Amino acid sequence: QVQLVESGGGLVQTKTTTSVIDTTNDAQNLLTQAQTIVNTLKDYCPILIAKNANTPSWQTAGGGKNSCATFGAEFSAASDMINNAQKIVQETQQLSANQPKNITQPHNLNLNSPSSLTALAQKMLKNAQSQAEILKLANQVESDFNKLSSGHLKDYIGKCDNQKNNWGNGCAGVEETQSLLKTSAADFNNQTPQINQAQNLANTLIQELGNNTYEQLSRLLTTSAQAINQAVNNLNERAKTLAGGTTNSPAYQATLLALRSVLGLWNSMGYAVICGGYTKSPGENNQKDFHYTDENGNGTTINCGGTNTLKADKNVSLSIEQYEKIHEAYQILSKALKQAGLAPLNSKGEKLEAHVTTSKYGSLRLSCAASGFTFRSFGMSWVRQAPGKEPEWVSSISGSGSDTLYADSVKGRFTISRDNAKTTLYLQMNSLKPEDTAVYYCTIGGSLSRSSQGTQVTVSSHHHHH
Amino acid sequence: EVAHRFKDLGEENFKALVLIAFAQYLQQCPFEDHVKLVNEVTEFAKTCVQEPERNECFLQHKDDNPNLPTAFHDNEETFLKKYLYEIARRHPYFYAPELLFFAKRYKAAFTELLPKLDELRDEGKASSAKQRLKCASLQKFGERAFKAWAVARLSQRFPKAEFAEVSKLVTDLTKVHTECCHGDLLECADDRADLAKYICENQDSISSKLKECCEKPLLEKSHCIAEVENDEMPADLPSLAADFVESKDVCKNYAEAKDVFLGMFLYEYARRHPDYSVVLLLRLAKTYETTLEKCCAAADPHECYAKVFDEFKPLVEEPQNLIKQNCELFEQLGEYKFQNALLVRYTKKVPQVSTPTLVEVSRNLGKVGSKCCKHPEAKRMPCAEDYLSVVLNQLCVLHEKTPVSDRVTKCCTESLVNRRPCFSALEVDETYVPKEFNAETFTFHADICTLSEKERQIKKQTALVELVKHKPKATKEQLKAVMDDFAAFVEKCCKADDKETCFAEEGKKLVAASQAAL
């Protein structure tokens, strides 16, 4: 007599908390949000999931090894974009801090004293030096983006393509921002003759201040009189669009590229990152599901914690706290890149409310103690009843356990696993919804039932913390 | 216990039963000492009106081949008594109730030619070799093999019986055959009578054709029970696929009871196809089981064991098309020309077998066609395996004694289920060396005109075989040309006034035509 004795769990109550963060869409904040993603990825270097044309090339390649083994130069190029884009936010601060002034009185010594012309020439060249540095830094992150692309995340970042998730793709608009950065830095590099003339003109004046006062004023009154005014004019017009501009500023399109690219690499690769590593109490469940609801409503979820719990070291998974900060920084970056946008580098920034939804207690494994037959050479399966509805096959496994089949409704959450020794079939359910309420029975092949089955309860509670 | 035994079937048969009892066990002792021993036990049986290894020692004493080998009108009692005692002491395991049944035909024919004397004895020794074969098949292969065969056989015989009664009949029938293979007439024969009685009580649930057998007494009852004509199926049965492969839970019911589920498959398939050979039914069962074993361990066995009937079709195509192609060839050719064609084919594929052995094999193979090709296709394949089993087992048994070739040794030692197929599809033996030409085999003497027609056939066929062993170039143009000229030469020179001259003068003329050509 074949004996199938299902001994799983019963009542599950899955709590899920949405906590809304109030932040700002200014550049230096989003840059810190992006540093959280990248630095955590490099400094701790998590093992990738070792899963196949459908799956990415880097997946079958660097799967089962640490992340930096596959995305070393991609993490480095991403960190460079972030730190360089931070420098251009600092340098536009110094740019707007040093704004030169026009020559008011052409023929006077009361005002327009030697000290005022000295300070004005200083403001001229400090303004031009700051402008030159952020143009260099803008083309610097452009090269760092060409390095981040055309590597392992080429045909991934920059292409976008419930339902099928959009993981593995950039879907962050980096091709569009880059093209604007190209045209933006193109027009500004064309203004290089003007900024070089303003640089030298200020350097002639600092030497002309060494000349005698009345003697040099004689030739200054009569020419480098309007020349300064002209030069100072295009120098201030340049610094305005260089800081306050959006599509016109290489500094805006550079910071926007560094943020969208950090969103791109996490959209392309973050799903493979192993999380849930234990810090203490070896085996602590810590199973927290991190929800990823994109802007159009189609939400995914990543099951982090959990024979699935190992340490939380460098090159050895990540802690739930570490993934919590990655998830917060992603959701704060997703919004304000999708809704608010990037506030101009000279602007103060506007407020936005970014939700971070995460659930707990949504996991449960079942066990079927098979006996009375040759369990090792029989493909087993799980089926669930539910009230009134016909029996629904959820999953099935082969005799050796290598072949696993799952239904579309279950696909992505549950995982079948047999034990040929000790002859016990398991079904590990994760991220389970109230619509999973059903009595579960294991079966040899499928269809009907011949056992005392499992238990049928699932309840979900949601909290909106502020 | 001798009371109920003696009141059944009369007083006469118990005398001969005691006779052949020890006449089979101890064989070298004479005749008159057995007769007095018969009366010794017989009169005490009328007066009233062991341990396992003990009978195994008696079985070891059984010598299957002993060193011992008007009168009816004068005293048929002692005449048949010696005849029965002599058959018993020749074959120590021969069917004892059939021995008495053959004695009834023996005394009835004497009280009333070549078929009468030859066919009677050779049928008995052929049946004697049949239980030896079924016992040798019981061993080596096992009780499960016999179980499976019996399931397919008697479920073809009684399709109206449920699987429970068929499987029941199989279990007790295996017990009967294991006891009769142990020569234990204390356990066999009565089990044969118990099973014959049991079949007669529940005759309605098995088959109605058994009504003639239950009116017969205990002897011929179980005899004709082994001879019952098959009963007709309900002629309304569904496709067994709907309960075996088209349906689900196949791997479920297989895990519940593997052999029982496999027996349900064979019971349904055989009861639907009586026109198939029992060997074919076991071919289909072993293919279904191997398919079930492979598919049940997959993640999705339904898509796996589906299209298993595509594996069944070629296993039934190969023998069926061989039946119709050899029947139609024998139909247009006749028995003799069919035997000649059989001579060429089997000497082509394996010329290493002796020339005589190839001759009578091809002869009786033509007799196989002469017997079965008269029956319709509904009974062709069963008829074919009934004779091909004995014939193939016969040449196999003799081949183990004198190993001639390796292809036949391989085919004889493989499974009995794939013997006829493996013997078929055997290509012409490659690299066979043309035998040395010796003209003494091509000598024709006037005795062939005086020889009997049956003898004439063997003299022509033996020359045909030895001809094939020389110059293996066997394009049918040269074969037909040799047959045309030689058959005309034999008759034209037989009608000559001095055949001794005609045979020798046109012999080398046709030899120089047989040679100087290939």
Numbering used by the authors:
A (entry chain B): 1 to 51, 61 to 170, 183 to 243, 252 to 335, 348 to 507
B (entry chain A): 6 to 54, 94 to 113, 125 to 167, 178 to 583
What's the paper's own text on this?
Human serum albumin (hSA) is a nonglycosylated protein of 66.5 kDa comprising three homologous domains (I, II, and III) that assemble into an asymmetric globular heart‐shape module with up to eight distinct fatty acid–binding sites (Linciano, Moro, et al., 2022). Each domain is divided in two subdomains termed A and B that are composed of four and six α‐helices, respectively (Curry et al., 1998). hSA is characterized by a remarkable solubility, high stability, low immunogenicity, an average concentration in the bloodstream of 600 μM, and a circulatory half‐life of about 3 weeks (Peters, 1996). In this context, the small and stable heavy‐chain‐only nanobody NbAlb1, capable of binding both human and murine albumin, has recently been successfully applied to improve the stability and prolong the in vivo plasma residence time of multiple small therapeutic candidates.
To stabilize the protein complex, we grafted NbAlb1 onto a large and rigid circular permutated protein derived from H. pylori (c7HopQ) to produce a chimeric molecule, called a megabody (Mgbc7HopQ NbAlb1, henceforth termed Mgb). To stabilize hSA, we carried out co‐crystallization trials in the presence of myristic acid (Myr). The crystal structure also revealed that within the Mgb, the NbAlb1 domain adopts a bent orientation if compared to analogous fusion chimeras developed for cryo‐EM studies (Uchański et al., 2021), thus proving a certain degree of plasticity of the hinge region connecting c7HopQ and NbAlb1. We were able to easily trace the electron density of hSA residues for domain II, though it was less defined for the other two domains. In terms of the binding interaction, all three complementarity‐determining regions (CDRs) of NbAlb1 make contacts with hSA, establishing multiple noncovalent interactions with residues located at the peripheral extremity of domain II and covering a total interface surface of 560 Å2. More specifically, NbAlb1 interacts with two sides of a groove defined by α‐helix III of hSA subdomain IIB (residues 313–323), a flexible loop (358–P366), and the disulfide bond (C361–C316) that joins the two lobes of the groove. Within this surface, four main hydrogen bonds strengthen the binding of NbAlb1 to hSA. NbAlb1 binding to hSA promotes the formation of noncovalent interactions that shield the surface of multiple hydrophobic residues of both NbAlb1 (F27, F32, G33, I98, G100, and L106) and hSA (C316, Y319, A320, C361, A362, A363, A364, and P366). Our study was the first to examine the binding mechanism of nanobody NbAlb1, revealing that this molecule interacts with an epitope located in subdomain IIB of hSA.
